[PDB]
Ligand binder design. Structure first.
Ligand SMILES: O=C(N[C@@H]1[C@@H](O)[C@H](O)[C@@H](CO)O[C@H]1O)OCc1ccccc1
Ligand SMILES: O=C(N[C@@H]1[C@@H](O)[C@H](O)[C@@H](CO)O[C@H]1O)OCc1ccccc1
Lengths: 367, 367
């Protein structure tokens, strides 16, 4: 279970070692700021090994990936380019058919698997994933690698865990639906559906973040944001970089100049009461995605993934914040039946690019 | 594709005919009021014959089902019970592990597969489905029989359709996500997911009805029901029997008398303005479910199913109500990127028991 980040040149060098003679999967984790492309292999002992290289989404244009793909094949021995079983990339948007991606909120243009090289993307063994679909696949990879507890911690157990499972919560993904949320630049969601007929997990990409926020007792707070965006706020408007910034502005009341999402998180890590309140506010709305999705989708587990999540561990480690989140997760009318208390919440507690493992894990199903 | 309903006696008689000395599938359609149970055979050239009997949920308890199975067993010879190869029932509630059902809204108790007699429920070849999970399967069954355009009409064709499908809209399910909605007594919802990897369709049960309603410009309207319920309204509160009645009582303000739901749709068919106004408001919220779910689930199609939709066909054929339903389906901030209008909307136009067909098709996958 491991990935080594390299420059394009050291990548080429590495790709000639005797360890990298096995058949290979081309993977790419594309974001709105940067992309990470490279190759994955199993070596020995059920171990996953990848080395990738970072590219900057400079033009901020999804089609720039075509360029990078070329730049790889040219500058690389075709005694390696031939060992390519499958090509799988993820992109930060809705993907249709596994072959067309867009429109994007970060970028412009459309991801088209047809306009991709076939040395990197062998026909019938190639897919374009939504990033959180790749992440879901990754979550599945972590479970099959028997290492779930190493990357995910329980935030609190739901009622339904012990009725489906004898193992401790956090030790396995569990024979139930698992909803994956990624609160980052944007707000990513996917549902790892569980088919009880055949006991199979299947990743279903979702756009939970773009739904209109339903109310609680916060009609005014929503209205304030509504008036800034000229749009009915959706969850992502409240749970995202711009959302955290918004919450900070509402907290200070102009008495401090606006600072960035990242900076707000730093301040909270440093104990700043204003930032900290902004963080709590952000998490109040994350937990609303949770309680609504818990009803609609009935998951056995909800899992919070991403580097944001791992890095903000100072926040989840605090049991007062955790109880307030727990409180808000149950703040749904249907809780009087226990529907929100069914669910187990976990969070990623250790850095791992779930999307990269996801692309490779998906590559297996294609071949 | 053909279902004769009988009674216990003539059922036990029917099953002695040598057209029924063939592999049998036990099916059960459990509504909130009645329950249809019987057996399904295959016959000459992809012919699917079903034979069922009716029951009453007079105790309004799900566990009562177990005593119906007992009756069937005893009054049924061992000659024919032995031929049961699969048993599949649907129930009007959330189901877990295809085995535990509940809690229910219209009924008390919990549906346990572990309590059902193994004569009708062969272990490893039987399941409990949610009613719309079963309807989902039914929808697939209709498509496979190449008879889709017979039972479903196109309300409007969405943008993503000609791009994913060459066949005309309405003539096949389509290689895309299909969101099934059943606005009847309760608001049912299931999502037939299409996995572009293996080209397989999967049915994913949802509870969209019980999520808290997002606002448009209807705060006061929502507050009013909120006040009557002492509960934050969810889509089902607006789209259901109780929801239609409520829309009526808000039209007349007290003038005319309060009617039952069926009565209101009746008055609307005949032309009553109060009634037609009430059904427009109901469909305004039905369309908001689709609007919000179109974003969250990215369906290629939305299909409205139920005896309701066939019976109230007059409302949908009216080119005026359709233009208005269309306008509400696109009433979503995310429409500025075309998300809502991607989706093709169809309605059931001919009576058919989707759930019973569904139980049978699920049964076939379990064998
Ligand atoms: O792009 C998104 N949604 C994306 C998701 O697909 C993705 O999983 C998530 C994590 O990167 O970021 C969201 O912003 O919605 C479609 C959209 C939104 C806004 C403008 C155009 C298109
Ligand atoms: O029962 C349901 N939901 C049911 C659905 O499962 C079903 O598909 C639909 C059509 O029959 O009616 C809804 O009311 O949710 C659980 C619940 C809801 C409200 C109160 C108690 C329990």
């Amino acid at each position: 279970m491991n990935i080594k980040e390299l420059s394009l040149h050291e990548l080429c060098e590495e790709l000639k070692t005797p360890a990298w003679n096995v058949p290979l999967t081309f993977v790419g984790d594309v974001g709105g700021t940067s992309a990470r492309m490279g190759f994955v292999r199993e070596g020995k002992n059920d171990s996953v090994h990848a080395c990738v290289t970072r590219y900057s989404m400079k033009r901020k244009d999804i089609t720039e990936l075509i360029e990078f793909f070329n730049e790889i094949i040219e500058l690389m021995p075709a005694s390696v380019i031939k060992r390519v079983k499958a090509g799988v990339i993820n992109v930060p948007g809705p993907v249709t058919g596994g072959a067309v991606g867009g429109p994007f909120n970060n970028l412009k243009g459309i991801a088209r698997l047809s306009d991709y090289p076939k040395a990197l993307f062998p026909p019938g063994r190639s897919a374009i994933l939504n990033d959180l679909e790749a992440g879901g696949f990754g979550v599945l990879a972590v479970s099959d690698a028997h290492v779930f507890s190493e990357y995910f911690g329980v935030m609190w157990e739901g009622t339904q865990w012990r009725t489906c499972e004898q193992e401790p919560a956090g030790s396995v993904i569990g024979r139930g639906r698992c909803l994956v949320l990624a609160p980052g630049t944007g707000l990513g969601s996917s549902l790892i559906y569980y088919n009880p007929m055949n006991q199979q997990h299947i990743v279903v990409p979702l756009e939970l973040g773009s739904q209109t926020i339903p109310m609680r007792k916060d009609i005014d707070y929503i209205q304030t944001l509504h008036a800034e965006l000229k749009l009915l706020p959706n969850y992502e408007n409240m749970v995202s970089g711009a959302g955290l910034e918004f919450h900070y502005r509402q907290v200070v009341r102009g008495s401090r100049p606006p600072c960035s999402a990242g900076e707000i998180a730093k301040l909270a890590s440093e104990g700043d009461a204003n930032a900290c309140k902004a963080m709590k506010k952000y998490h109040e709305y994350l937990m609303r995605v949770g309680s609504e999705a818990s009803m609609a989708l009935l998951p056995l587990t909800i899992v919070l993934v991403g580097d944001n999540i791992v890095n903000n561990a100072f926040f989840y480690r605090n049991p007062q914040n955790l109880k307030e989140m727990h409180r808000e997760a149950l703040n749904h009318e249907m809780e009087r039946f226990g529907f929100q208390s069914r669910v187990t919440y976990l969070r990623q507690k250790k850095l791992l690019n779930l999307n990269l493992m996801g692309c490779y894990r998906c590559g297996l199903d294609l071949s």
